Design a protein around this ligand. Structure first.
Ligand SMILES: CCCCCCCCCCCCCC(=O)O
Ligand SMILES: CCCCCCCCCCCCCC(=O)O
Ligand SMILES: CCCCCCCCCCCCCC(=O)O
Ligand SMILES: CCCCCCCCCCCCCC(=O)O
Lengths: 52, 242, 240, 278, 278, 240, 242, 52, 49
């Protein structure tokens, strides 16, 4: 991308018929860390005491 | 034909190439993607999950017991509980954790780290603990008076069983080297010290266990990242697997 | 206001605890039925409802000084129990989640910590490939021999990536986990494959304020959740 | 044209790391961010700004080198069959378990959906394994389960009317081809807590999920080889979905088709003589 | 299309040199452009037009051959590892200090931010170093600090699951690849007035900035070599930012990792017998 | 109207000179604090203000007939002096600029010229790699042995590329340089790295209108400017 | 496949190629660019900075003293102080300066050059000096009468310590050759002479130093440029550096 | 550019994803020679006397 | 000539390639398609019999 900073901007051009032929995907996809870090029924806000 | 000039790098195979390539089964139609819980898009979602430090790495301790730092009733004031060189590389206790094992695959790191400690003594067992982070330049702090001069939290044992010492990203540069490669002087990237001290003492009712434990846990903060993939040192083989 | 007090009502069965920590919902995913877009089997499923979606209590385990840990495969552990067990025996394929409740009370004069892992696809090994009495131990469950390696050449320390709670005796006497169905296919056989393993591993050993060591049991209570079954034939109990 | 627009996907790596807000001192009984409870199974919520006095930091670091695509998106060795001169035929069973680096990288997840780019480098050598000259075509035939396997260099199976084949030269550029996600399942499985068969609980079929196994690559030279040929088979994983992270492999791998480990000395990190000094 | 417009950057070298305005004679006490004061540290401000009578000159000369990009923007040799036949393995430590021409060009600046294009030419020869025929693949593996190094030609490290590798033929076209600015610092440093380590002032760690060191390239042939191979490693510096110009190196270089020089005869330009004749 | 008369007031300290040339501001860049866009260290910096941003006078040097020159590393030379020295000792990392003032008066009956270099990243060598007593000489500074080669295999003649002034005794008795922070990173350790070297090299030797040679000292006065410190721990004085 | 015809120059490696090439680390995200003082975009910014001529290149003068041309009290009229062949190449005094060392990397040059001289005598020391530039065609001027016929400045020692002689670009062609390559007759590009003369004399009070110095300095004017990169003659090695 | 005089006019076309792959930049960038030639607090115009 | 970089897989023959290729008889004009009963477009029409 002739460079913004940490932004790689790519035009993936597949020359073949099957999508599997395309090169690797460069998108950043959504991160939901809280399904692993906060996997609890009741949210615990940072400023509260956790138990009770 | 269109006139061309193939240049240098013709016919090479680079393992990190990003090129399209002909599909050997161009008519295949894969099975649909179904919903599965826990989809991961980025390995820093794993690095932000707490894992247990193999913190009791004393010679002779084997198995599950390497995960519990001893904490005892002291007969002297201001004693030291624990000492740990802040390092994502090498082979010390951080190296076998989730964050440490991810760091084995990377060359460089940046960001804040947090250490969560859980006390395991009886309900009736009390104590106060000082957890210190010393930025680099010197040695491990020798006494609690010297360690307190750094970043530190003071932990009171109670109903809330656990504490966090956030080790903040304090650094001359935007990134550090994961490894401690000697020939390359990567000790340049020394990242400081973590020490644990008795702030008062562990106190027990008569005839209770005079020894309890801390389970140390570590994870990355949301400001953390890794660069440069590299081979994992301790995942080797001498033969093809059969 | 209090996540130390919980009540869990499934079917004709209700659990309570006055020292919970919270409830772990694995991957933030409550159990759910299979949608028409992901389903492949064309027959109409049987959904037994409350006859199977209820808490079942397994036999208790003594927490001893030397205990390395215990484990149960699911649905394996409940395949011979109640109407869950019967629906799982009579169908080729099954799907559903779990509500797991581990109980262990002791005193304010005790110390010790249990780690309570729900491990999906927990394939096990040691120095040898394991036999059937360890891969599918049934309602009585199995025991760890390499708790440090999590029976699988990984490490116990890194198993906090799995859905978990602790039972730290100074804090709580019970752990609750809600588990969604996890698999790479929509449904799968209950006798041939274990989707989850419930693992309870002592980390800090059990210590008493005297040298006389009374009996401190651990007790597992498991409720199936949002179950479906397809492929009705005769009842088949085990993969042997 | 719009039709050529269909063959182009603009895709962007511009996700940043979290920044830092300045904070000041706090003296209160209201807000206690440092008090935690690891028993819940939740990771600590405390942040930098609530534990010390911070400055403001504008985020500048990317996260893309740890995206699952980037982490798996390079080629690794997965098969090294040797074609001898006695029969001029060899094969490789297709799975990523002979060589430990890719297998250990995959062990961070349970289920993985991907495509594959395969790359084959052929090298000729003498009996003493010194590089040598040999120009010859070779044939790699995909043989799926249930297709008859070639038994010789001249077997009429190499017709390849229905098996796909690639023909390339030993001293030409490397053969390369892509493959879609081929499992009958909706993902591959890195680990399997079950049996390969009904009515069977043999230990050798524990942990064996046959929906991961798509068959064989078979290799001949188109004439009888004068020198032995070594094929190196590289796989790059691409277009990758990953579910359910795991405790990664820590003990060395010992067998191709199960997780057996030594476990003689229960430790991973190195020892020291005292917990209060280095 | 606009998406393809993203992959094209129109960039122009049309900066000209300064011109000349005609001037006439000046007889005054007002304007004295020739009187200077070098003590301030400023360079003289006097121009042609104010010192003599000038004509007008329209500027026509470009400046682009001395732009920092053009000055560094060509390939130069930086590494010449020799692969012998005994072990068929070699390596090159990655820095631009073995060969003096590029190092001396870099010595005009303190901090330099750039990308690199690497080009590798492999040449086979006999023991008496006469060119010889040898067709073989070779592997160049980037081994970053902390990754285990290969110890043999058949070491399983060459799997390369996480280290990037390039495979090319000894008698094929040259391998070529680009590299972004990889320093943990915000620029590279050509010179370092400090120590590589805390708590250490060993002379061998003076002037050593380990953030310039990104590791090693390792080299094997994919079979055991029949003849020795010489790899020539060329680097072209591109997309270049430069800060803080220096007095350029004048004494010959003597060591790879420090600025030691002879300094026996303190002079640079040649001598003459008299200052008032040539 | 007069760039021969200057006054420099920093903190509780003020310098004057009646024979300045001008003031050199290196690379036209006045010292400035670190912006949030370039900063990496997350802790809130300490900015000591006037307690450290003030002129400090080092011990004077005699200009002798044979003198090859003198040099000081910064911050090295001030690391044990005042509240600058203490803030630099107690923090892991430091950043800031300098105000340098070199004094040397003599008579209208004297001749001689000093070159006053501020050299960034002045790594030094000779026929041998130098020891610590030369790389970090402290407040007393070091002396040149290869002034022609600028201690670094380059040449003194080309060092006018560096920010500089002259002290030519017929013209001026003082040189003033303002130095911005220069580094390849935002902050850096004061004990491990010297960002600038102040070098004073005689070019035209010192000559007197008699053969009796009275004492003509050179005196260096340095003020830190726009300083920040991060990484508070115990005080560490040197990299040894 | 698209029909093509690879032509001559296929698979060659030219060191001045301007071609894109596959990145071996296509997911890497570098550290931001920070502000640093003194960014250089073009090496002619360096060439316009004055540097000191190694002007006192007489056999036997070593070290810093090679930078000071002697100037004395004369006992005869119209004497010569200095003589210098105007040359960016070769090995004379201009060759070791900033402009001269840049010219070592280039084959051709154009533009005006300036020479700034600083007197270093005592405050009480007086003098007047003639600085001459003689365009090519003949030899170095033999006496001040001949030198004055050229471009020249006359310097009065005083409060303003320094003078500039601008050597203007006076040339048959738009560019000259940097080098004096004999086999190629690059003396064709002879660029003239610079000489320095006593215009009156150096005069001192009784018992003052009867010898003082000029420090000569040189730089390029804004109308100056270089062409054709070339290897530097005197930056050599006989072995790989270890 | 099929030629204006000393104007090279180039369309840098990068075929790869990462900006580092692109060929060398042909722009002429701004020259500020005076940060090195006139690095002084008070400007000295050419026609003035420098000192005082 | 347009600068190019032939990569891996150059000159290989894959039996499932989907590429255009030069016709050895570029002026040939085939016989028309006539109607024939029972045209099959997909072998799953046979599998349903
Ligand atoms: C043969 C048709 C030519 C089309 C290829 C044009 C160049 C490829 C586009 C690359 C897009 C991303 C490059 C970048 O900006 O970093
Ligand atoms: C040769 C063309 C068809 C070959 C299909 C190859 C697909 C390989 C996917 C392997 C996924 C399972 C990995 C494993 O079991 O360890
Ligand atoms: C092989 C791929 C990764 C290799 C990284 C090479 C980057 C080289 C930059 C060298 C900059 C420092 C130069 C020096 O220290 O003299
Ligand atoms: C394969 C896509 C073809 C696109 C390439 C067109 C030619 C390259 C553009 C060169 C632009 C600068 C040339 C010039 O005018 O000097």
């Amino acid at each position: 991308g002739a460079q913004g900073g940490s932004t790689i901007n790519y035009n993936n051009i597949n020359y073949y018929s099957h999508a599997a032929s395309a090169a690797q995907n460069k998108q950043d996809f959504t991160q939901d860390p809280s399904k692993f870090t906060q996997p609890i029924a009741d949210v615990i806000k940072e400023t509260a005491v956790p138990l009770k | 034909g269109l006139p061309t000039k193939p240049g240098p790098g013709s016919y090479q195979f680079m393992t990190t190439d990003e090129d399209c390539s002909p599909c050997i089964l161009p008519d295949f139609q894969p099975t649909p993607e179904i919903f599965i819980p826990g989809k991961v898009n980025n390995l820093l979602e794993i690095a932000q999950v707490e894992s247990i430090l193999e913190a009791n790495n004393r010679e002779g301790v084997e198995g599950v017991e390497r995960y519990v730092i001893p904490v005892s009733v002291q007969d002297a004031l201001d004693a030291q509980i624990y000492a740990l060189r802040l390092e994502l590389g090498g082979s010390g206790p951080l190296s076998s954790s989730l964050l440490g094992t991810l760091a084995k695959h990377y060359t460089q790191w940046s960001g804040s780290v947090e250490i969560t400690c859980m006390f395991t003594g009886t309900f009736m067992t009390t104590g106060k603990v000082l957890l210190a982070y010393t930025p680099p330049g010197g040695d491990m702090p020798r006494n609690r008076e010297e360690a307190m001069l750094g970043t530190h939290v003071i932990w009171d044992f109670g109903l809330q069983s656990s504490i966090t010492l956030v080790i903040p990203w304090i650094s001359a540069s935007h990134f550090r080297g994961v490894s401690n490669d000697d020939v390359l002087n990567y000790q340049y990237y020394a990242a400081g010290h973590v020490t644990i001290w008795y702030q008062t003492n562990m106190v027990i009712p008569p005839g209770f266990p005079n020894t309890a434990g801390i389970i140390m846990m570590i994870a990355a903060q949301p400001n953390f990242s890794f660069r440069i993939q590299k081979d994992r040192e301790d995942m080797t083989q001498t033969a093809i697997l059969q | 206001y209090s996540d130390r007090v919980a009540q869990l009502t499934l079917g004709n069965s209700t659990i309570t605890t006055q020292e919970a920590a919270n409830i772990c919902v694995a991957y933030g995913c409550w159990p759910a039925k299979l949608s028409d877009t992901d389903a492949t089997s064309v027959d109409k499923p049987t959904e037994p409802g409350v006859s199977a979606d209820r808490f079942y209590t397994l036999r208790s385990k003594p927490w001893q000084a030397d205990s390395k840990g215990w484990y149960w495969k699911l649905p394996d552990a409940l395949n011979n129990t109640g109407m869950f067990g019967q629906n799982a025996q009579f169908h080729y394929i099954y799907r559903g989640g779990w509500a797991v409740h581990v109980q262990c009370n002791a005193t304010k004069f005790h110390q010790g910590t249990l780690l309570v892992l729900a491990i999906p696809e927990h394939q096990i090994a040691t120095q040898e490939q394991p036999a059937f009495d360890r891969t599918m131990p049934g309602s009585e469950g199995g025991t760890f021999q390499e708790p440090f390696w999590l029976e699988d050449g990984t490490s116990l320390g890194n198993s906090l990536i799995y859905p978990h709670q602790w039972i730290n005796l100074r804090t709580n006497n019970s752990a609750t986990l809600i588990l969604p169905y996890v698999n790479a296919i929509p449904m799968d056989s209950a006798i041939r494959h274990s989707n989850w393993t419930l693992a309870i591993i002592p980390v800090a050993p059990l210590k008493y304020a005297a040298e006389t060591t009374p009996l401190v049991p651990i007790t597992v209570t498991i409720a199936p959740m949002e179950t479906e079954y397809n492929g009705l034939r005769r009842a088949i109990a085990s993969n042997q | 044209g719009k039709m050529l627009k269909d063959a182009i996907d603009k895709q962007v790596a511009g996700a940043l790391v979290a920044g830092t807000t300045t904070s000041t001192h706090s003296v209160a009984t209201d807000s206690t961010p440092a008090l935690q409870a690891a028993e819940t199974g939740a990771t600590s919520t405390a942040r930098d700004e609530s534990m010390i006095e911070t400055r403001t930091i504008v985020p500048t670091h990317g996260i893309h080198e740890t995206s699952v695509e980037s982490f798996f998106g390079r080629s690794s060795l997965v098969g090294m069959p040797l074609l001898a001169t006695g029969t001029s035929i060899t094969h490789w069973r297709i799975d990523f378990r002979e060589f430990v680096q890719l297998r250990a990288k995959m062990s961070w997840f349970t289920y993985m959906r991907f495509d594959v780019e395969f790359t084959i480098i052929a090298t000729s050598s003498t009996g003493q394994n010194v590089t040598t000259e040999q120009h010859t075509t070779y044939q790699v035939m995909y043989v799926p389960p249930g297709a008859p396997v070639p038994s010789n260099q001249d077997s009429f199976q190499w017709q390849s009317g229905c098996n796909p084949s690639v023909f390339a030269d030993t001293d030409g550029p490397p053969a390369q081809f892509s493959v879609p996600f081929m499992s009958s399942a909706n993902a591959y499985s890195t680990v399997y807590d079950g049996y390969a068969r009904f009515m069977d609980t043999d230990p050798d079929r524990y942990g064996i999920l046959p929906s991961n196994f798509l068959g064989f690559m078979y290799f001949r030279t188109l004439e009888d080889a004068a020198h032995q040929v070594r094929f190196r088979i590289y796989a790059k994983i691409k277009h990758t979905s990953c579910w359910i992270p795991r405790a990664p492999r820590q003990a060395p791998y010992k067998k191709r088709y199960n997780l057996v480990f030594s476990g003689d000395s229960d430790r991973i990190c190195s020892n020291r003589a005292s917990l209060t000094s280095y």
